[PDB]
Design a protein around this ligand. Structure first.
Ligand SMILES: [Zn+2]
Ligand SMILES: [Zn+2]
Ligand SMILES: [Zn+2]
Ligand SMILES: [Zn+2]
Ligand SMILES: [Zn+2]
Ligand SMILES: [Zn+2]
Ligand SMILES: [Zn+2]
Lengths: 255, 76, 146, 73
């Protein structure tokens, strides 16, 4: 009748697991903990859930309890965060094979080295470089409806999804302050999308702030981003109708 | 139709769906092709959350459109 | 749900071991994700009043931290005018799922007892506390009374 | 000593090297094993860029440790 310290349910010894400090948890709680760490908001290191334990769950218990897919994705995310700690947010994956590669962020000629891929693309619009010659991303998108619709959809996405400057993960705010702490350990601002250095980035003058030009901590940029998305949609429809030869919406309903 | 899905790590997976397929089916295919539990999948299309009650046609998701998986992070 | 099991257990443990400075705990058994209660501090400058607070647990609890909001106004460097608190032990970056509400409340009471003006939400009050605690304490006593 | 080098696609190439082997030597072995030119290889251990002048014992790369391999232009 051993009681798990996380979910508080009672189980036998066979349905339990431990860390290096012999803390007892149920296997399902460890599974959900690893799930929140991998496919959710949580720390990478699967540390022992108890604060008194600086140790973590041993890799043997992880390989015995966690399913194969969860463990594989955990190793993948560990590699992702190590790449983030190494070369920051300069790793780009090919649009055709997702093969990661490093570039100086000054050249857009991403030639996928994978012999099963080897596709020349443009890292700004994911467009083919042989067509992209002599033309900008705007023009290459306007040269086709399949390109332009997807480009407008991606613009509307980027108008809301905020990328992390470390692991490159996309974030949205459910509620609370405008300070975002990513699951990789990097902090950013939800108003300026800049990697902040702490709480000295926001304004703390509650007495309209005309003593510092710093971002507010509680302002909701929901309406501004929504209006920008709607304007992108409307202007894209206008452009399509203006360069459509008597031809026939790009994006979800605007509510 | 062929659509794409951006995972939280940043990879692009390819899905083959129908306009009448629901967000539940889309998340199930995402789980089959990557292992992400649908309860932890937060989907965004053109800056709009994809609710399970609706369907792809309710969001005007056409061919070669790319959905994105993002984090529903709190504020502090 | 794990959240429901864990919060019913924690509540059953609090109802047996009542907390000293956290009283009048109200939780609807039909919605375990919101708790209301009264913080009753022991020391000046806050020990002449009490403060209503609310705890909101995410559906993914205990794998994501709760949030605490003060409903009563309080004069404190680490609590803003809307009652939001940035209690480090329940920050997303520090959160451990084994942390229980009794420890969260103890941490909150320790912060109330000893402000941390180096990392404030109200820099004015943090400056006043760090420069002249006697003055800060008088201001806080008056704010508690009012 | 046996170490592992995991690439970005997940390929785990096993290497037999000594703890006092330079990262330049490790990248040369990676080249003659897979074909990746050393001027394009970037090895990472615990989030630190491994310099071609340091050695496996400088970063204290122990037995059966994993090194993440990324590619440059
Ligand atoms: Zn449990
Ligand atoms: Zn432990
Ligand atoms: Zn490629
Ligand atoms: Zn381009
Ligand atoms: Zn990140
Ligand atoms: Zn900002
Ligand atoms: Zn200000």
């Amino acid at each position: 009748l051993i009681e798990c310290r996380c979910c508080y349910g009672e189980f036998p010894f066979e349905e339990l697991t431990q860390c290096a400090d012999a803390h007892l948890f149920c296997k399902e709680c460890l599974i959900r903990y690893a799930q929140e760490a991998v496919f959710g908001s949580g720390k990478l290191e699967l540390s022992c859930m108890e604060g008194s334990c600086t140790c973590s769950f041993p890799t043997s218990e992880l390989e015995k309890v966690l399913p194969q897919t969860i463990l594989y994705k955990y190793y993948e995310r560990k590699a992702e965060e190590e790449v983030a700690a190494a070369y920051a947010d300069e790793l780009v994956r090919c649009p055709s094979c997702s093969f990661p590669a490093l570039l100086d962020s000054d050249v857009k000629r991403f030639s996928c080295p994978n012999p099963h891929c080897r596709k020349e693309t443009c890292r700004k619009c994911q467009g083919l470089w042989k067509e992209h010659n002599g033309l900008t991303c705007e023009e290459l998108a306007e040269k086709d409806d399949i390109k332009y619709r997807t480009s407008i959809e991606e613009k509307m996405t980027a108008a809301r999804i905020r990328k992390c400057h470390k692991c490159g993960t996309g974030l949205i705010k459910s509620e609370g302050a405008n300070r975002m702490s990513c699951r990789c350990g990097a902090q950013m601002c939800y108003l300026c999308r800049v990697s902040i250095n702490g709480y000295d980035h926001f304004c703390q003058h509650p007495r309209p702030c005309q003593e510092c030009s710093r971002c507010s901590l509680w302002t909701d940029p929901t309406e501004d981003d929504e209006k920008l998305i709607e304007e992108i949609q409307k202007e894209a429809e206008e452009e399509q109708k203006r360069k459509n030869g008597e031809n026939t919406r790009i994006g979800p309903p605007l509510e | 139709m062929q659509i794409f899905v951006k995972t939280l790590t940043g990879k692009t997976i390819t899905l083959e769906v129908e306009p009448s397929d629901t967000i539940e089916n889309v998340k199930a295919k995402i789980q089959d092709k990557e292992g992400i539990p649908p309860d932890q999948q937060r989907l965004i299309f053109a800056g709009k959350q994809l609710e399970d009650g609706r369907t792809l046609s309710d969001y005007n998701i056409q061919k070669e459109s790319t959905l994105h998986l993002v984090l529903r992070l709190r504020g502090g | 749900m794990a959240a429901s099991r864990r919060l019913m257990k924690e509540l059953e443990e609090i109802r047996k071991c009542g907390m000293k400075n956290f009283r009048n705990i109200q939780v609807d058994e039909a919605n375990l994700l919101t708790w209301q209660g009264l913080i009753v501090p022991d020391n000046p400058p806050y020990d002449k009043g009490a403060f209503r607070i609310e705890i909101n647990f995410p559906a993914e609890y205990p794998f994501k931290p709760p949030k605490i909001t003060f409903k009563t106004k309080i004069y404190h460097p680490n609590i803003d005018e809307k009652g939001q608190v940035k209690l480090p032990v329940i920050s997303a970056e520090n959160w451990k799922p084994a942390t229980k509400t009794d420890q969260v409340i103890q941490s909150l009471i320790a912060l109330v007892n000893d402000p941390q003006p180096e990392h404030p939400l109200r820099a004015d009050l943090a400056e006043e506390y760090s420069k002249d605690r006697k003055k800060f304490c008088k201001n806080a006593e008056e704010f508690t009374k009012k």
